[PDB]
Design a binder for this molecule. Structure first.
Ligand code: 3CO
Lengths: 219, 201
């Protein structure tokens, strides 16, 4: 999706201001919002790829105006409705329609173990690797309306495969209920010049991006 | 003017009420457990943070065997010090050298190595850093007071997949026979993101 979230190469966002001595959480409400994510993922209410794409789908202005955890809050209020876990009315009123109909999967007994383990996107088997490190590859020019992880700034560009990480779930399909379609993920190295042109580049600098096998074609 | 889109702008006046309303809803339906949520908050508020990565760096500095293991298998490497889990399942460690300066970003969102660095700062997750880091690294780094030599290659890694990156900074000169603990004190968060260098003694 060619949305405002795909920021790479954009101008006009200005200086990178940073807070001195920044707390992990700057407001109490952020603690609630943050801790909700693991809780809801544990329920299997949605997967991480759906979560990401839900954020991509908020209003562009809303996305820019909202502090980080407002993005998460948005997903919870909207993706849970889309998935049929909550109704619009419930979300609007903050009052459950009919009592405690579910049981929390994330309980105090398993928090530490679940957090320490996480959930790797790596898979045992999937599509065979078409490319080897050293191969010149071109990123395909695709413009899906749905979820994807090929940044707009890489599309149509030529780079060098520098790492084959093995097989992983494909977010493009996992976010839209089309299965995992596991395949290889590579780190691809692009020169500054190749990405940004003669003028806007520095001769030494390189940009590396992690791209799925079928995002690519031989250069 | 004011902060608008750099991550530090003011939240809506009613945000805390909105959050409380949703939380009550989710608790009432039986979707979430407040007690478990508190444990999650404590974990990232007090237990997990850049001190973790600092220990990894210090050990790698003093122990070439560990460094080799770490560079060969990041996940297993950091596990030796008891760090693992969410948003660090598949780690890749980036070695800074006299010829290469590494730095990472997530242009698409905020992907970041939680187990070794904790939750990212607001600036890492905001448009200014994300948009400019992949096009003008030197310009961004200069804003953090870091000037990379012109003849040194800068490698910017965009965290677009499920690999998570952490920078192994170069050990500062004049730190002979330092203990892992004294060395670890020099390792800043910025030095492991690549937006700064370890402290000079
Ligand atoms: Co991200």
């Amino acid at each position: 999706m060619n949305g405002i979230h795909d920021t790479g190469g954009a101008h006009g966002y200005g200086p990178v201001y940073r807070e001195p001595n920044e707390p992990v959480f700057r407001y109490d409400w952020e603690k609630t919002v943050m801790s909700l994510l693991p809780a809801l993922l544990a329920n299997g209410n949605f997967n991480l790829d759906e979560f990401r794409h839900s954020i991509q789908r908020m209003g562009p202005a809303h996305y820019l105006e909202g502090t980080y955890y407002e993005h998460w809050l948005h997903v919870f209020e909207n993706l849970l409705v889309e998935k049929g876990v909550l109704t619009a009315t419930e979300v609007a009123t903050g009052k459950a329609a009919s009592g405690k109909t579910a049981t929390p999967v994330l309980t105090p007994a398993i928090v530490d173990g679940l957090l320490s383990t996480g959930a790797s996107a790596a898979r045992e088997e999937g599509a065979r690797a078409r490319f080897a490190v050293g191969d010149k590859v071109r990123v395909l020019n695709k413009n899906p309306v749905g979820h994807t992880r090929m940044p707009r700034y890489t599309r149509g560009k030529v780079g060098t495969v520098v790492i084959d990480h093995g097989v992983f779930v494909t977010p493009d399909t996992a976010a839209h209920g089309k299965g995992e379609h596991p395949q290889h993920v590579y780190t691809v190295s692009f020169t500054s010049v190749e990405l940004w042109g003669q003028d806007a580049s520095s001769p030494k600098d390189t940009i590396r991006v992690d791209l799925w096998d079928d995002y690519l074609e031989p250069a | 003017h004011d902060h608008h889109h750099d991550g530090y702008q003011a939240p809506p006046e009613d945000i805390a009420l909105r959050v409380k309303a949703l939380e009550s809803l989710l608790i009432e339906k039986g979707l979430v457990d407040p007690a478990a949520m508190d444990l999650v908050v404590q974990t990232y508020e007090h237990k997990v943070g850049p001190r973790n990565g600092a220990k990894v760096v210090a050990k790698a500095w003093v122990d070439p065997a560990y460094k080799a293991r770490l560079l060969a298998d990041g996940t297993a490497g950091i596990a030796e010090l008891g760090f693992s889990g969410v948003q660090g399942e598949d780690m890749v460690i980036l070695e800074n050298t006299p010829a290469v300066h590494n730095v990472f970003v997530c242009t698409l969102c905020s992907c970041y190595p939680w187990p070794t660095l904790g939750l990212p700062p607001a600036w890492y997750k905001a448009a200014p850093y994300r948009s400019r880091m992949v096009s003008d690294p030197r310009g961004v780094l200069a804003e953090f007071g870091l000037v990379i030599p012109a003849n040194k290659e800068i490698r910017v890694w965009d965290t677009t997949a499920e690999l998570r990156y952490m920078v192994l900074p170069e050990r500062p000169a004049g730190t002979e026979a330092y203990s892992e603990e004294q060395l670890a004190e020099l390792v800043t968060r910025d030095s492991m993101i690549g937006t700064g260098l370890p402290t000079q003694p």
